[model samples]
Target chain A: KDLKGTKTAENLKQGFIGESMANRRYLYFAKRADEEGYPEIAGLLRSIAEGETAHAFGHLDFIRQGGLTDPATDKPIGTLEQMIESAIAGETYEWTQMYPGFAKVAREEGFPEVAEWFETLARAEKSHAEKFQNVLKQLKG
Target chain B: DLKGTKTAENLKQGFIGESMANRRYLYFAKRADEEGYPEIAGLLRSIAEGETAHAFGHLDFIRQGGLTDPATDKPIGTLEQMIESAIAGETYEWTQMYPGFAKVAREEGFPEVAEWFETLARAEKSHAEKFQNVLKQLKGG
Candidate 1:
């Protein structure tokens, strides 16, 4: 969606936060892999870290597009099942809409490589949603 | 000084990592909040703040503002350029920066710091390889 209004702005802010956190978490994981002598695994984690950073920066640019205002206040985090549901919804949006839209824009802007990155990220987000759904089913069972 | 030059430099790197980790954890906490994981988010927030404390301790030991760019630093380029820059930075850290620091620390009798630097060096090397891989994919390699 176009990052022109309040709602889109808030979404971008949240995306920024999520991606930034993922980047750091992957770095820590990479460190663990190194300590364990799994150099290739560490490299994989680092690559994911870089991807997360790019996603964060993309969201940041959108946030800046919205004039860098403060994001909306926190929403109530419900029970575990509810959390899984929310996470699924968020990931679904990214895969089906958010990153796809961003990818199109990147392509139109002549940044085909960046566009590919967005598409790749969109696929990953879909996988995340699938994982969350699996977890939700396990919790229900 | 008891700390010596190598120890002080390692402390600086440590401070930077901890500081970044603190902020990243807080961002993750926010993401958890939005996903309806209140308890998990709360725990993340607590740990995030603890990282802040660790970062501050490292900073105190360093006793210098190593955060700012040098006077010769110029504004970063476009998004794609920035990504390239990040890849280069990770490469430098793993290939040159951390290795040199680790060696110096080992020679200066700061074994603990030396170990830390070595671990970080390995992690950074992985990060560089990851970035390169991702960049290659993005460029249609």
Candidate 2:
């Protein structure tokens, strides 16, 4: 059903699904620093992960409480595959675009030290995508 | 004598404060999971783990005697008081300490710490806001 104009249940469900996926993406990155050796960086990453979780839960509760979606599905708004795709896309965007752009600026500004940290974080973001990709690949195989 | 000792004790208190935060995040994450907010729940878990790391970092400083009690030459402050004090410590770090560090980095060409400081400053600001909100919520405001 077309959910664009109407306040369809699917639209609300989709929204929650999108947000939850985003939260998971943040968690995935937060775990990255731990996978490496930067426990302190991981700590900060975890804090951000918490914020994302809060954001996701806010949306989930909204969906579950009958605020947005149709009360029928009583489950998630999308397929597991769709959710994974969204997560993958968001991670890719952060890795390829936003974070890299910031790192570039830091470098040009003569903040190589700062730039290095950005580079580290950016690599971590990329690792998130690779993780998702591995999952997707496993599903295919 | 008290002034110098208080300063040192406050730092140790801050470490204890970080420990409590880690515990809080863990509790929140477990709650989110119970609510069926899996994505967010996972995020919370990551954050909690990160908090653990931060707490340890603080403890390391405490052990080094960067901060201590004047009379006993031991760490001062209970865990509960540490939480309250942490709110203040994080605030100062976010506001004065981090910015000052960043400026020094810029001057001394210490881009790494400067860059890290910039990010850390932003995160510290966020932590202060979150803890303040928690305080308000707990007060039933």
Candidate 3:
């Protein structure tokens, strides 16, 4: 069961894990934002949480339908941490590196829709990192 | 035989890809809020919703046995296999497919979707890494 190759069950299992992590991360952040008095931010986090929930359910169902889950647990085998770390790292890498490249590519490719999407979000992600920093600083202060 | 297996593989790949997209959008959205780019975050949130939708759709497809590797009659793949496929997929989409789409969209001044994909492609490489980590975990276990 070398589950790392391009096999169907492995992909579903990985996806399920990723989705679960996303759902958990959103829940964690939403609670954190609320506790920090960022109700509006919390609301936004909740909205993302809804999306993560949908993704998790979708992947889990995919795993089950594919007969990939353990018979005993009747569930896909994985953890929340994998997905959470993926989500966090994905956020950091894209905002900092990838989006800028997309902007350049858009100009060359003669398509604006995709480029705009990257640029808009890149700006937003930059802000998010800063906000987290601010929150950390305030908490420390 | 090829069609069934390919379809399954693609379905799983699509699910993985979409999950990556969702995470990427969230990263930027969070970043936007941190930097006081509230509107940017809103837009990122919208894109995140779309990515989530894609992830669900793909997961549903995979659940229906859409992730088979018919040639080998296997249901799972190794981490390296998944990563290679993902990286190739992302690169093609970002460099060849997305840029043109972005340019056209920008010309038409459709900022929302344009921005969405732009940020998405930017996050593709990192997305591959997340997949790799999942693969590593499975291998280690």
Candidate 4:
């Protein structure tokens, strides 16, 4: 686990990238919130944006612990409609499959806190899926 | 202009916002490409890169640690401890922080901001799970 050659180490790095990108996206949304005249909303966005940064740093430090360097790259995106669909699909995967499986793994691996994170995330992703679905409906309509 | 004024805080926020926008636009660019809008996507990605440059410029003015610590100034911890910290952060947002922020925004007649907060709360949950999954892998390996 401490070795960079392990698959787990690679996964840690990938997770770091995902979290880092997420942090930035939320901050952008915060700016939009401010422009829209929602100062409080902007504050919340900034707060959570910082939270994402913490998450990113956590993963990064873990990757470092494993003696690995960050090696994240940009992912290819799709059309607005396609992006919405992709987002929904990805969230659904987390809710129904990915997080659940990961939570179980964490528990088995004796990381209770990590398992809790997965379980909570699974629930959250379900909510995200519904939100994206609603957006899709609006777009289609 | 004095040091440690609101100007510094503003610059840090600007940096965070631009950094986030850069990644988000790249994601949007991918969607544009998928939707048969290659030119639009390319333009989006170019702007996204530009956003990165702006963020770096702001960072140069603000310095590292200019922003408040998301982890509440705790010293960096072990890999497992770091993962726990991230989980706690996301959990707080989804369960307590963002929910409260969204409620205030809604009561204050900022529907859009409320919506953003709600959406972000859900997103944070998924982020927590991502970290959990990686932690599991590390532990198992």
Q: lDDT tens string, model 2, B1-141?
A: 223443334334333333333433344445556646576557546644544554444343343444442112334243222223435645775788667756765665445435655765686588667546544543552
B59-117, model 3: which lDDT tens digit per residue?
A: 33332333532112333233233333433444554565445545654565545434643
The per-model lDDT (C-alpha) reads 0.52, 0.47, 0.47, 0.53
True contacts kept of each: 0.00, 0.00, 0.00, 0.09
What docking grade does candidate 4 earn? incorrect
Which runs of model 3 end up more than 4 angstroms from their true locations?
Answer: A1-9, A13-83, A112-114, A128-141, B1-141
Across all candidates, the chain A TM-score values are: 0.50, 0.50, 0.44, 0.48
Model 2 regions lying over 4 Å from their true place: A1-55, A61-77, B1-141
Candidate 1 accuracy as TM-score:
0.32
Total clashing pairs for each candidate = 0, 6, 45, 7
> Model 1 off-target regions past 4 Å?
A1-75, B1-141
For model 2, residues A31-94, the per-residue Cα lDDT tens digits are 5446656465446546755654553454344343443322222323243343334445655765
| Residue range B1-141, candidate 1, lDDT tens digits | 413333334344444444444554455566667867676677556655655554444433333323211111211222223234446666766687667766765665555545655665676566567667655654662
TM-score versus the correct structure, for each prediction: 0.32, 0.34, 0.30, 0.34
Quality of candidate 2's docking, in CAPRI categories? incorrect
DockQ numbers for every candidate?
Answer: 0.03, 0.03, 0.02, 0.06
List of chain B TM-scores, one per candidate: 0.48, 0.45, 0.44, 0.49
Top candidate on DockQ is 4
